Amino acid sequence: MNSTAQGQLKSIIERVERLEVEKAEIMEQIKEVYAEAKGNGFDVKVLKKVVRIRKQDRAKRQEEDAILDLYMSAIGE
Amino acid sequence: MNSTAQGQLKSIIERVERLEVEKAEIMEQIKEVYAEAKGNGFDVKVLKKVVRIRKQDRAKRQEEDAILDLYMSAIGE
Amino acid sequence: MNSTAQGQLKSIIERVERLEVEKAEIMEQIKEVYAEAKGNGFDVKVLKKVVRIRKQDRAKRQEEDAILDLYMSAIGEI
Amino acid sequence: MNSTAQGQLKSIIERVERLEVEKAEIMEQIKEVYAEAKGNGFDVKVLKKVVRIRKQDRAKRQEEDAILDLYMSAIGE
DNA sequence: TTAAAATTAAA
DNA sequence: TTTAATTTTAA
């Protein structure tokens, strides 16, 4: 390939790798918060579901919760 | 490697690949059930949720849901 | 929902769950193949890679690999 | 739960969610880098493979690749 | 979307 | 040390 093209490839790779280093740091910071929470006596598993739950629109989730209750009711569970 | 060594290797590969084919068939059959369910007016997302839930122990389930409600009401939404 | 709709739902759930039990069994058997292989001196990680590779069309993988080497060479990685 | 426990939970959730926002922001930046690369005639799929490969130790990578060559050849490849 | 796929943490 | 769960990719 070209010399310039080789330059772009190298820049792209280095750029992605810098971003993935930042991502890794953030992931470590998240695990540190949960570590702190666990030390406080909180249930990490539930805490994570709390975060996940809050990511979706309230109205939509509650609607889906209602459908779930309808289904669980139908199959007798 | 030996003739017996490669003989074993060829056996392992053959065994894994035959099981992969069967696993693929089952996975396709599972999607067909959901496709049919969707066509019948059911919510596939909720359906998969129902399946997931029924895999969990009843006790632990309501136990983690109780903690969830505690956390959720504590932080509100 | 209707008593009939209830029937459809239950049958659907039963179908998925029986199929998932089947899937778990197959996945367990696959694991048993790898564990037996591992006990015989084979590299499990490499074995799975072989299986993965053999899933792709020879033509495709050969070209993707060619491109890969081109990139790895360009950045002085290889 | 105590008011202190309530305060802990509130900040724990808020800290995680802010980190999630940042992590998600980096993830879209990475997709943008790859999106731009695609426009520059680069193979995104191969690009990602280069990154993953560079995350492994050169010495170990060459070793696994050597074994791979042995296996493939043994079964005909 | 769907996936299958995997390395990894921890029960 | 085996079910989990975390991550990422294919497709």
Together in a domain, B54 and B33: no
Do B28 and B52 lie in one domain? The reply is no
Range of the domain at A47: 43-77
Instruction: Please give the structure tokens belonging to residue A31.
Output: 């695990």
In total, how many domains does chain B have?
Answer: 2
Region of A22 on the Ramachandran plot (φ > 0 left; ψ -120 to 50 alpha; else beta): alpha
Cβ atoms within 10 Å, residue B16: 20
Provide the experimental method for this PDB entry.
X-ray
List the single protein residue with the shortest CA to C1' distance from E6. Answer: C45
A36 and A51 in a single domain? The answer is: no
C10 φ/ψ sector (left φ>0, alpha ψ -120 to 50, else beta): alpha
Same domain? For D25 and D38 the reply is yes
Determine contact, residues C37/B2, Cβ cutoff 8 Å: no
Residue D77 DSSP label = -
**φ and ψ at residue C39, rounded to 5 degrees:** -65, -15
Residues A70 and A35 in one domain: no
Q: Residue C45 is encoded by which pair of tokens?
A: 């990680």
Resolution (A): 2.3
Q: Give yes or no: residues B27 and B50 share one domain.
A: no
Spell out the residues 6+ positions from residue A58 whose beta carbon is closer than 8 angstroms to its own: B77
CA-to-CA distance for B66 and C72, rounded, in angstroms? Answer: 53
Tell whether D38 and D1 lie within a shared domain.
Answer: yes
Do both B6 and B33 map to the same domain? yes
Q: Are residues B37 and B65 part of one domain?
A: no
Burial, A4: exposed, middle or buried (Cβ in 10 Å; 0-12, 13-18, 19+)? exposed
Whether B47 and B66 map to the same domain: the answer is yes
Interface of C with B (CB under 8 A): 8-9, 12-13, 15-17, 19-20, 22-23, 26-27, 29-30, 33-34, 36-37, 40, 42, 47, 50-51, 54-55
Question: Do residues B52 and B70 both lie within one domain?
Answer: yes
